[PDB]
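Hey Z.,

So I finally got round to the NAI thing we talked about over coffee. Here's the setup:
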Amino acid sequence: ITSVKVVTDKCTYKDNELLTKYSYENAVVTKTASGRFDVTPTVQDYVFKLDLKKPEKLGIMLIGLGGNNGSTLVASVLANKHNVEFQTKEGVKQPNYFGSMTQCSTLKLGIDAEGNDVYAPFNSLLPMVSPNDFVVSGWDINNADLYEAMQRSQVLEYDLQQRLKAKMSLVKPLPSIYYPDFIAANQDERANNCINLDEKGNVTTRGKWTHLQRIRRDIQNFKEENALDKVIVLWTANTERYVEVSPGVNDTMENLLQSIKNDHEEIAPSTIFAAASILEGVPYINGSPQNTFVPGLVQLAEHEGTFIAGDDLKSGQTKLKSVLAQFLVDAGIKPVSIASYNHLGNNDGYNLSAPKQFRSKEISKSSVIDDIIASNDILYNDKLGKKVDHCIVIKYMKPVGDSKVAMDEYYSELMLGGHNRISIHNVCEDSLLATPLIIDLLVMTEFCTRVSYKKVDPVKEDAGKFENFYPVLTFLSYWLKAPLTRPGFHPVNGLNKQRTALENFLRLLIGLPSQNELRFEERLL
Amino acid sequence: TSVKVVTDKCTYKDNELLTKYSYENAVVTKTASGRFDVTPTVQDYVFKLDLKKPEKLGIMLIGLGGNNGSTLVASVLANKHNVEFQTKEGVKQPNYFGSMTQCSTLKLGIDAEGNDVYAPFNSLLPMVSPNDFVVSGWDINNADLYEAMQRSQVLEYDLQQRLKAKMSLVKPLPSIYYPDFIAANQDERANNCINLDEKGNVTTRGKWTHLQRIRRDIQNFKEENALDKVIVLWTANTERYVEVSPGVNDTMENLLQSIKNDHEEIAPSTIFAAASILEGVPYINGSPQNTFVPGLVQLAEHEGTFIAGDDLKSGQTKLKSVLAQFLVDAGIKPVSIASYNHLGNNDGYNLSAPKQFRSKEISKSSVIDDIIASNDILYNDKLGKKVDHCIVIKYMKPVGDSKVAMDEYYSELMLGGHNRISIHNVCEDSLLATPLIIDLLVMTEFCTRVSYKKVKFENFYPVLTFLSYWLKAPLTRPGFHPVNGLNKQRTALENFLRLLIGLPSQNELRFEERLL
Amino acid sequence: TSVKVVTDKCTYKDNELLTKYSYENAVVTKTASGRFDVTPTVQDYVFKLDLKKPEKLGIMLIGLGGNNGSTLVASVLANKHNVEFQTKEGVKQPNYFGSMTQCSTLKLGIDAEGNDVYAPFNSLLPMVSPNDFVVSGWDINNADLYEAMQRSQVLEYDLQQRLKAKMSLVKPLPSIYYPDFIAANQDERANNCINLDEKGNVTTRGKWTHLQRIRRDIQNFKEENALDKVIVLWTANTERYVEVSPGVNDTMENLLQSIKNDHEEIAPSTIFAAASILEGVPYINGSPQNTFVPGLVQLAEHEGTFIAGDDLKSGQTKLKSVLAQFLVDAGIKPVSIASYNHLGNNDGYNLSAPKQFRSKEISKSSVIDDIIASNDILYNDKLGKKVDHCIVIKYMKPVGDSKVAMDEYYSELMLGGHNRISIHNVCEDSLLATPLIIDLLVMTEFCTRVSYKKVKFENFYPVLTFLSYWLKAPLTRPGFHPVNGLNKQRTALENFLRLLIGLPSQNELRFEERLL
Ligand SMILES: NC(=O)C1=CN([C@@H]2O[C@H](COP(=O)(O)OP(=O)(O)OC[C@H]3O[C@@H](n4cnc5c(N)ncnc54)[C@H](O)[C@@H]3O)[C@@H](O)[C@H]2O)C=CC1
Ligand SMILES: NC(=O)C1=CN([C@@H]2O[C@H](COP(=O)(O)OP(=O)(O)OC[C@H]3O[C@@H](n4cnc5c(N)ncnc54)[C@H](O)[C@@H]3O)[C@@H](O)[C@H]2O)C=CC1
Ligand SMILES: NC(=O)C1=CN([C@@H]2O[C@H](COP(=O)(O)OP(=O)(O)OC[C@H]3O[C@@H](n4cnc5c(N)ncnc54)[C@H](O)[C@@H]3O)[C@@H](O)[C@H]2O)C=CC1
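And the result:
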């Protein structure tokens, strides 16, 4: 077991609790007509409290448990927890969590006697739950057990599936809520495990409040059946179409709850799952692009004080885009055309073949560069043009299966009429890329539930009381395509900035300042 | 555009900015039990920035008549005189796209809504504009810069014609040509050399006299143009490496004596670097040869003059310093990185020779070493700690200056999976490199106006590692390992500019949004 | 499936097919005035096809324990015994996909509607099935074929396990290992050699005795398995070239004497080819070394035994023999063709050495020479008659047998335009090569049953150029230039099979549709 111990008077320990002092500095800016930027530095001191006692087991409930990602997630936990080595044509392989930033990345803690960097595991600075301690269950409109799910997904090595057969065969998804109009029509045949059935045993959208109550109870039941104290819910089911947001329906917490009781057509299954989780005080993460978090739902989360986050896992093509586009603009290069094509042959692609479902994904993938473009008016302005042509395409091509093929072209302008053209072919084994990110989201969300803080009054010791994070956990942005935000705030999509935020947060909790890369030990005499 | 920070850390006195800064870091030790003991450190400083920048900055390029050299002069003239030009896409206005100092922005803070407010990179503190560069230099070929532009085939025909009158006036000074240091196929190109014998033939004898002539050229350039500040940058053919031998080029004293002795380990770049250091003018190496031997670093340390470089990081390697870092930071394990390149300009022609290619193979290959050493979860004895990496550069005349980079990043994912990223990158080499040369010059000049003291003012340690963002193989201070990640390199520069104006490091914590 | 043509050109007599054929061609001369004078020629023949094919065909592979050798045996066993196997995509049935003789079709004519009717390539005339191959061979490494499969990492794990019992029974015969002909890194792999001295150390002395042993191995293989027909194919490490010297390997007589003299220009492949020719068994070279020196071609001509080869044309080069031809046939002018490759199998490991790589550089580079020489409108002194072409092969262990080919075809269009085709081709080398080895064996056996006479029957000229479709650098008859275009190579085979059954050449005129 690796650990970190910082010698600092900013941190004090007491009864499994870590209390850390931190001075947060930032600055407010105004721009004069003359083109002058007036910068006024701001400061706010805090005391962060971290409950060091992490749960021995963490309950995980996945909506879409029997899908490619859901089944692969369960397989990865079982394989790593029980060290299930498996056979491949390249020999015996040992399970690992590669692709997971929380489990397989490192962070610089400082320098050695020679002035060179010393790194430690991301999850070694402070106590975090291990995916090996995840107790997983969930719902799926299809009743196939998880062994059948692995067979169906065609994601994992045959021998590994066989070694996991006995255990996975026993994991069966709980019945779920299936409202036909929210996902592709071609999914009809797949639905045979539903709770919303009428007297004649037929799927119905009537009684949405009852469906909501069933989900809340499902959570309570799962918790007690596993003698668990903490649970997190994550949506990893078919991408739904967007719902319309209209006054009097889902614009406020009050209207939202009433609309559910009224079986309103703007209430999707994800809307119900999110509402149920929020009401149970269980963090809810949206791994898909539909606009689940309508204003009325955000309001509900704010009122209940329950964490919510998400909107589409940022796993491959978009993850790279949030790195490349940022790099080009940061370098003073001007992207003017970004074409992104994708073809895959799994059920995700099958569902996305329907225009309404595709639309949701089109928006999340296209929006990732908006803030980057708006950050540079030297390159993007009225005189030179402030637009970047951007197209997103997703086609269902059964033969490639889960190995989604992303083909992109980044065409940029250089000085004096020149250009730079970067063409990419990226083979994305979607579930293997996504599963570790789902793991990261769960690990980081749990960590955040143990953090509280209070503003410090410079002239009054121990003033105010501890509070939890604002409900929308933007700290999870690294893993999501279209970061949900607090009203009024714009999202920041740059991958490196998103990781830096997490890095500096873990650092401040153990008494360390932000990474500055100034390296004065080397640059100054 | 300007920036004014309300802070008591900064005080202005006689066109001089004095800024207080507390530098924090931490020293780490790891125990056998796997425990990291971190001890924070702190050191207060007072930085002084001479706000009086030169109205005109002298630039002397070695390899002035080459693709990059001629494009540099054209870019300065085109932008300075607003030379719009015709293209099949219509009339275009000149700009400095591709330049990080001229065309990128930095976040200064947030607005009343809590959202980011950005300002130009060169607006936080006064920096010299490339429009005010006065350029001269050397080249073993005497073609004037208009003829050089024609030869390079880099710029739009109409732009070349509109710049003809002005570019025809610029002619490279003769240089030092030691045949064995560059490709043999460059012989017919050399017709502008100072190192000639009684019969008028190129000679490697009299290297000290060659050094004195370069010093004279620098002195004359300053006097002719009434310039007080000059910077020299090597943008000439990539040279083969020289051997570092005890008693030859290991010390400042031995180095100078070796030059006087016409030692075979003294390359033309060695002489240009020595001459620049002796004239007190910063010297930047835009090529991969190991110009900065120990004796030269010593000389720079002794004279207190800036040196930096070793290969412009412009295209394939720049992207690699971003992608490889991204993958490892994400917990993904690259295991194979194949990088191929073909180009048809003189750079490629020179690089077609083994000894010259070798220099470039090293700079492009080393960019990921630090990244791989930073993660022992992925890279260790049990799982393997190596990343197969190959660098290939082939001369293919038809593509000209538009170098084609083809790469494949093959990485391991969990449970036996893989990720394969294949790339085809068309790099208009000179248009990518020119703005970087500009950045290096602008940033170097800025650094010469910075001094500091712990709390007598002193200048930066001679090796300007702050310029790493623009170089493939960052030269480092003895004992120190280079850091190649592009984003970290830009972050270093960003936080430096920020602290000079009293702002702390960017932290991205955004507590205004994340906390109640 | 079978084919029966109603024709008076064919007559059957004692399991023998006799076919009349009038071969037309034309001789051309060009005048200074630019006039092409064409004189048609005609020669009637009577071809005889022995319809009695062997029930079992002996196959002896040099390099039997390698990636291709072990995959070949696995493919034969899997298909012969219908060994279905599990994969993450479900149960799959074995097949010979990638084999032109087993899985491609040929147009026999049109139906009543005037539309094409196709039949299997191997259904026009009786050909041996790979299912009836009896395989043995040699390898400098003694691992049995199951262990060889494990080592190669080519086949699905479950298939390997289902074939374990049968593959474990196959073990390569010891071979001839002359260290200087292949990469030095192959030393530790050699533990199965016949050429050992008194101390039991590998030796290059006694080459004639090595030759006699190979002949014995062939004779024994035939006797042990009661086989009357055997074919030998080289699928071992690529060797470096040998020098062709007068008095050494220029003639049949000098060649044999050089072997007896243990001459340094006698490679292991030279000995295997000589031994095969002397035993009257066809010999196919699946590698690029220049095995067929003049003296060996002479020997084959004298003995009247078939020889062919020089590098399997399986992936990057196969596609090139299609794309380069397509562009030039279209009036488009390729000016730059860059071809890069990286792989991590033993083939790549061996090719990492310069001398071995050189052999492959030549075979892959020559495939476009004839194409470029065929069009003097595009390629001439005024416009330039060269196409820059580079071939690169790098060893990158992580990709294993899945070789990655990255190419760029840059061509000129009218009025200064260009076309740029960039490709990333993942080549599972053994799965691409194995069916080609099968095709070469099937087609070679077929050719041994063909004789003809102008109108005593004679066999084909020793060098079987009809096999060019499967080889990169077609060996040719003295004075004759090779033709590398894939489509023309398949057309040659197609029309040969057609004429044997009384059908004329495919003409694609389709007058049934084009004319009233
Ligand atoms: N795999 C990746 O790399 C990425 C995936 N995503 C999203 O994650 C989601 C899951 O992807 P996959 O596992 O590949 O898809 P999938 O189609 O294999 O699995 C989704 C599962 O959800 C179940 N389902 C559908 N509606 C449901 C409901 N109302 N309640 C309960 N179960 C329901 C389906 O029966 C299916 O088993 C999709 O929305 C996809 O767009 C987002 C970004 C990246
Ligand atoms: N363009 C790019 O993107 C990058 C270029 N570089 C390097 O920058 C250098 C310049 O590149 P290009 O302008 O394309 O090449 P180039 O060959 O067109 O120009 C170099 C010039 O140097 C001159 N020269 C050679 N030896 C000399 C000497 N001893 N003294 C004075 N002049 C001399 C040559 O006559 C030529 O005009 C090369 O070493 C190249 O490898 C490094 C990284 C990237
Ligand atoms: N796989 C492909 O797509 C193509 C392969 N080739 C050539 O086919 C050959 C075989 O390829 P692989 O099976 O992949 O290589 P490999 O290295 O796996 O197999 C070659 C085998 O030859 C054996 N060997 C070496 N020298 C020998 C000797 N003197 N006598 C007997 N055995 C000897 C080695 O021990 C090894 O098992 C190579 O020369 C390769 O360049 C040519 C064109 C395409």
